[PDB]
């Protein structure tokens, strides 16, 4: 099946995976150096062995393609992947005058009392970001997130570069270019950033009329993160291909530190006992070509028949 | 043998390698996406199937580690790898009042007359860079070459970042960090640069007391370039390991566009008919630890018994 490489990655890390401490305090099983190849002409790489929320992937990816860095758009689309980060900022400023939301995340999973209190407080924050237009501007804007890295790279001369836009133009004018790279890693910023981008950079390639893309992900959570990452970049490959009027080639996923958190081993083995089903199809609005103008209704995933969802705790 | 992965890369590109036009006008055979793994505890990855000049690799690498961007240092060490680039600049300014050094490189290989004239003119330029202290400052300084990318990244606030230095400090204080990345790709600069760096970025990794490194090379000339690239980064891995007092792990070489220029096929097959010999050893000065203070005499390659050199034309 199309997802076999991902299951193979799950196996070897379990086998060859050498223990390694980490940032949080849940140990990990890690490997270093690995590459996966997904032939996009054979189906869409959304896992069938475990239900993955494709709705969350589209909305997030669009948020990126719009050069947007504000969480209002995501909330506006029921997406809550980036809430925690904007929330951390809110809670730490002189304006917050609520409960003990200090070092929250870990504590939420710790005890019932807080899990509710935190959820009450979070909801309130989201509400303001959704309606208090000025609040959204202060505590809702993440600042240096992918959207601004891909489409508004700040230069040392006060300007902003639209890396992705220019790369798309290069594809159309010089398809056989080996310089079609887009970078998310900026040495000036990583030092103080909350979370240096995991998807460090990606490169485009054209031949035989097909576009392929290789991603370099410095760090990867094999159970919870990788199933999403494959989908966001495989999707992106389709989009750029559509805009440039090309056929899709492959998505090549390269890793630095690929790891399986220790508290996910049962679920991972749980997942390794099922048989992958045929891959879903992806059809895009043929009327629209400029991907920067895409909306949710423009991307349609066809007949995705996955196994039930598998729950697991976030390593904090 | 240790170099088998490189020969395997030579084979498949010859086999799977699909034709693809390129920047110059010598066609190429290309593949996209590929990774090699060199266990540095088994020997040093300098090719035995064809004599590779290790002297040129050390001098160039030191030039990088010194944050230096001036060609005087290289010439001072009989290294001429970066001459052409500084030369191009000289020839194109109001000060040059010599012959028809216009669009030179290609023409040199074209006809005898020019090949000599160009060599006479080049030598003169080098001489000044070596002795005319002020000339060396104008036409000898390459500007944005690896040395300044790795050790003097310019920020949007007038400062400079020593990426490599800081990464070395992170290794020593937080060995299990998945953020030990060093980037050579700066979106602000690539637009006008003569040659965007091929060695886009590299990542460090620590486990079991051993340091490993993965490189992401957007473009690679399989015959003339790759044998050098492996050596420079394998060497670098040893150095950082030595300074941080760690054992060497592996060097993982990842490629974007790996290609074999059409006018190198005979030589490549010529090279594929020999049997690799045992790998040379690398011993470093045990008295010195700060690699930024290393000199040529500090790096010693032991018993490297290679096959004769194979000549081939530069694709221009
Ligand atoms: N979609 C995502 C988002 C994040 N991560 C993971 C990588 C690491 O598990 C953690 C970041 O930790 P660190 O910055 O120290 O690498 O988040 C991932 O694999 N996929
Ligand atoms: N040591 C080096 C130096 C350069 N290159 C090669 C990669 C390409 O063959 C060419 C650069 O072309 P472009 O910038 O269009 O990729 O130089 C390489 O492989 N190894």
Curated annotation (Swiss-Prot), chains A, B:
State the active site: 198
Enzyme class comes to transferase
What InterPro entries does the record tag this protein with?
Thymidate_synth/dCMP_Mease (IPR045097), Thymidate_synth/dCMP_Mease_dom (IPR023451), Thymidate_synth/dCMP_Mease_sf (IPR036926), Thymidylate_synthase (IPR000398), Thymidylate_synthase_AS (IPR020940)
UniProt KW Cytoplasm keyword: yes
- EC number from the UniProt entry: 2.1.1.45
Location in the cell reads: Cytoplasm
> Matching CDD domains, A to Z?
TS_Pyrimidine_HMase
User: Binding positions for (6R)-5,10-methylene-5,6,7,8-tetrahydrofolate?
Assistant: 221, 315
The protein here is known as Thymidylate synthase
Outline the subunit composition: Homodimer.
Q: Which positions bind dUMP?
A: 23, 178-179, 218-221, 229, 259-261
PROSITE patterns attached here?
THYMIDYLATE_SYNTHASE (PS00091)
Identify the species of origin.
Lacticaseibacillus casei
Q: Name one GO cellular component term.
A: cytosol
GO MF annotations in UniProt: thymidylate synthase activity
Which positions, given as ranges, span the membrane? none
Q: What does this protein do?
A: Catalyzes the reductive methylation of 2'-deoxyuridine-5'-monophosphate (dUMP) to 2'-deoxythymidine-5'-monophosphate (dTMP) while utilizing 5,10-methylenetetrahydrofolate (mTHF) as the methyl donor and reductant in the reaction, yielding dihydrofolate (DHF) as a by-product. This enzymatic reaction provides an intracellular de novo source of dTMP, an essential precursor for DNA biosynthesis.
* Example of a GO biological process term: dTMP biosynthetic process
């Amino acid at each position: 099946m199309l997802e076999q490489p991902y299951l193979d990655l799950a196996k070897k890390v379990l086998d060859e995976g050498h223990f390694k401490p980490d940032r949080t305090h849940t140990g990990t099983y890690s490997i270093f150096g690995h590459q996966m190849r997904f032939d996009l002409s054979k189906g869409f790489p959304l896992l069938t062995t475990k239900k993955v929320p494709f709705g969350l992937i589209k909305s997030e990816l669009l948020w990126f393609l719009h050069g947007d860095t504000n969480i209002r758009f995501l909330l506006q689309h029921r997406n809550h992947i980036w809430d925690e980060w904007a929330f951390e900022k809110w809670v730490k400023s002189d304006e917050y005058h609520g409960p003990d939301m200090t070092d929250f995340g870990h504590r939420s999973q710790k005890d019932p009392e807080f899990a509710a209190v935190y959820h009450e407080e979070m909801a309130k924050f989201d509400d303001r970001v959704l309606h208090d237009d000025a609040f959204a501007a202060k505590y809702g804007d993440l600042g240096l997130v992918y959207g601004s890295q891909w489409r508004a790279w700040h230069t040392s001369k006060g300007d902003t570069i639209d890396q992705l836009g220019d790369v798309i133009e290069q594809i159309k004018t010089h398809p056989y270019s080996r310089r079609l790279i887009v970078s998310a890693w900026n040495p000036e910023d990583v030092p103080t950033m909350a979370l240096p981008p995991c998807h460090t950079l990606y490169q485009f390639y054209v031949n035989d009329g097909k576009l392929s893309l290789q991603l370099y992900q410095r760090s990867a959570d094999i159970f919870l993160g990788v199933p999403f990452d494959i989908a966001s970049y495989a999707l992106l490959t389709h989009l750029v291909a559509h805009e440039c009027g090309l056929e899709v080639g492959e998505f090549i996923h390269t890793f630095g530190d690929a790891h399986l958190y220790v508290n996910h081993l049962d679920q991972i083995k749980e997942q390794l006992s099922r048989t992958p089903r045929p891959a879903p199809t992806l059809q895009l609005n043929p009327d629209k070509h400029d991907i920067f103008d895409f909306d949710m209704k423009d991307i349609k995933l066809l007949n995705y028949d996955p196994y039930p969802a598998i729950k697991a705790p976030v390593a904090v």
